[PDB]
């Protein structure tokens, strides 16, 4: 199925307890690595990362992260100067890639300032999309170094995917498993003359699930309320969908379709 690898960076100027810099990695919804300006160490966040990557890996990336921390500190100072901003502001980065079930791939690299899009890299055109004049100033400086754009295209298309395939093998017993959902339909008259139908699912992995309500075997036109896909705390997830009023709930998960006729 579809899998992804992502790395985030968070920089905070003048932090109140809160680290000045944090960086976390993820494979799908699972945290794999962490670093912050307090520990100043890159550490695993999944036992399958810890057991398959030698101490030299964590040692080398600890040094790189100490450098990337200093880079974030200085870029955020320059951004605050450009905007004429004082006090506490945030700077964020997200880099990563996706390996789609059809073998095709995606790659992304983006920055945010104070939690809003700032610069979005387009690896297919080798350009940065800027949201305002300050972002345009930065885009011009970054686009002036042709080699760094080519390096970034290669990292997103080749290195990121190779790292993702490596980690999928290390964590295959967690990441490639399937735990089917337990699904039920609850019926209840709520406000006089208003019957609510809930289709509730839990105990499933991966978190991706499709739930819908059908009427006489065809697509609905009335309002469907959707519950978020939430972690249950044991590595599995839960979700629900509801309607008010022949109804049937349809659930699709990991290549298995299920129908619950009311």
């Amino acid at each position: 199925r579809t899998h992804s690898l992502r790395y985030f960076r968070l920089g905070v100027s003048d932090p109140i307890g809160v680290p000045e810099f944090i960086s976390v990695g993820y494979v799908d919804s699972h945290p794999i690595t962490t670093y912050d300006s307090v520990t100043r160490q890159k550490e695993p966040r999944a036992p399958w990362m810890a057991e398959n990557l030698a101490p030299d890996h964590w040692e080398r990336y600890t040094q790189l992260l100490r450098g990337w921390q200093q880079m974030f500190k200085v870029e955020l100072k320059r951004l605050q100067r450009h905007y004429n901003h004082s006090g506490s502001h945030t700077y964020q980065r997200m880099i990563g890639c996706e390996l789609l079930e059809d073998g095709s791939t995606t790659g992304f690299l983006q920055y945010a300032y104070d939690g809003q899009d700032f610069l979005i890299f387009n690896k297919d055109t080798l350009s940065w999309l800027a949201v305002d004049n300050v972002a345009h100033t930065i885009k011009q400086a970054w686009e002036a170094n042709q080699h760094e754009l080519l390096y970034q295209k290669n990292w997103l298309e080749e290195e990121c995917i190779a790292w993702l395939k490596r980690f999928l093998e290390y964590g295959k017993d967690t990441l490639q498993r399937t735990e089917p959902p337990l699904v039920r339909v609850n019926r209840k008259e709520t406000f006089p003359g208003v019957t609510a139908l809930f289709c509730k699912a839990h105990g499933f992995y991966p978190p991706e699930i499709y739930m819908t309500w059908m009427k006489n075997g065809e697509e609905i036109v009335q309002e469907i309320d959707y519950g978020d896909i939430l972690p249950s705390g044991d590595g599995t997830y839960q979700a629900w969908a509801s309607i008010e009023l022949l109804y049937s709930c349809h659930v699709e998960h990991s290549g298995v379709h299920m129908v619950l006729q009311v």
Partner: antibody, heavy 109, light 114 residues
């Protein structure tokens, strides 16, 4: 990170063309560099390739084939001042530079 | 660019020595290499940014100090004949970047004699 191979030495004639090959076998790839180092002097950056193709900088061109794990440094209209050592270096998955032993280039007048 | 001292040095076995290196290019990453015949450059120690250092491939018999953003000194604790070599300091704008090249110092030729 593992192995870089380039010839120890090459000889060509003034005015002609020379191609210096560099083959690499590494754990990941983040780019290939060429440096020039004159006898008793410091190495100086010549070129960088990370995607497939040929980049020309005056009389020097650097080629890369990612699928073959192969690069070459092409020097045209050879001059006596081109006599030097040429170093090939690859950045692996952890951004460490893997250095080749260098190619001593001798130009015959 | 990169200012490395001394250019030449004769040492007796057991003598201590410090190589200096300074760059005023506002670079964050600094490196100490040794160059020996028939082999590729070998990293001794490096400093990815001010306030951090780590071993390279051949750290034994050496130590470093990233004194400030500009300076990275290399120390030979007890000079040994195996340390006879040409030492190069280098710097780059950052580390953990692909395209950034190295800027090298002029080189320090050390000869260690009994």
């Amino acid at each position: 990170g593992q192995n870089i191979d380039q010839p120890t030495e090459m000889t060509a004639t003034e005015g002609a063309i020379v191609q210096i090959n560099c083959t690499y076998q590494t754990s990941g790839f983040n780019g290939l560099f060429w440096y020039q180092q004159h006898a008793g002097e410091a190495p100086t950056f010549l070129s960088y390739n990370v995607l497939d193709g040929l980049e020309e900088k005056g009389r020097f061109s650097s080629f890369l084939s990612r699928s073959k794990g192969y690069s070459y440094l092409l020097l045209k209209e050879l001059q006596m001042k081109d006599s030097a050592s040429y170093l090939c270096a690859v950045k692996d998955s952890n951004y460490q530079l893997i250095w080749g032993a260098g190619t001593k280039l001798i130009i015959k007048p | 660019g990169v200012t490395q001292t001394p250019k030449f040095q004769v040492l007796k076995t057991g003598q201590s020595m410090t190589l200096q290196c300074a760059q005023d290019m506002n670079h964050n990453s600094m490196y100490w290499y040794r160059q020996d015949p028939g082999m590729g450059l070998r990293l001794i120690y490096y400093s990815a940014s001010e306030g951090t250092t780590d071993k390279g491939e051949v750290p034994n018999g050496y130590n470093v100090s990233r004194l400030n953003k500009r300076e990275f000194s290399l120390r030979l604790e007890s000079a040994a004949p195996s340390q006879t070599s040409v030492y190069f300091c280098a710097s780059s704008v950052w580390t953990g970047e692909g395209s950034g090249e190295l800027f090298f110092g002029e080189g320090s030729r050390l000869t260690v004699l009994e």
